[PDB]
């Protein structure tokens, strides 16, 4: 129904606001766009599903998340692919995996303060019966 259309509209804005805020943070934007096959040529070869903060802004307005735990999943993935692919001691693969681990930490952060959890079980719902 258009109220089912409207509830999805609040979702997506609602997930694009907290995807900038992400993005405009300065210890992200590694996260920021997909890793360049020049600069890494071995990423792709190595990580099976790139995400980034770009494709999360793609993939709202694509209408692929139905939910905000779909959202989440693909915040989960940019991470879980950073400690993946950095998995080493020296610095460099240490402060991309803090970093991962700072990003995953405050989405969820964001949205444990400013989802309501009826808003996200009326999107379940929804999904559940399409
Ligand atoms: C996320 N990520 C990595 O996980 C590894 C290398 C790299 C290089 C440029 C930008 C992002 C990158």
Redesign the pocket.
Same mark, same amino acid.
């Given at each position: 129904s258009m109220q089912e259309e409207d509830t999805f509209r609040e979702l997506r804005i609602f997930l694009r606001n907290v995807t900038h805020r992400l993005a405009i943070d300065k210890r992200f934007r590694?996260?920021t766009?997909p890793?360049?096959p020049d600069?890494?040529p071995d =990423?792709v070869t190595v990580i099976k599903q790139p995400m980034?903060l770009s494709s999360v802004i793609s993939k709202i307005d694509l209408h692929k998340y139905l939910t905000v735990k779909d959202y989440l999943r693909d915040i989960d993935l940019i991470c879980s692919?950073?400690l993946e =692919?950095?998995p080493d001691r020296d610095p460099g693969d240490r402060l991309?995996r803090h970093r991962a681990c700072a990003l995953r930490d405050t989405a969820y952060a964001i949205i444990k303060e400013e989802l309501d959890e009826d808003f996200e079980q009326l999107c379940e719902e929804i999904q559940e019966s399409r």
């Open positions: 590694v996260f766009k890793v360049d600069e890494v =990423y980034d692919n950073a =692919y950095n991309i």
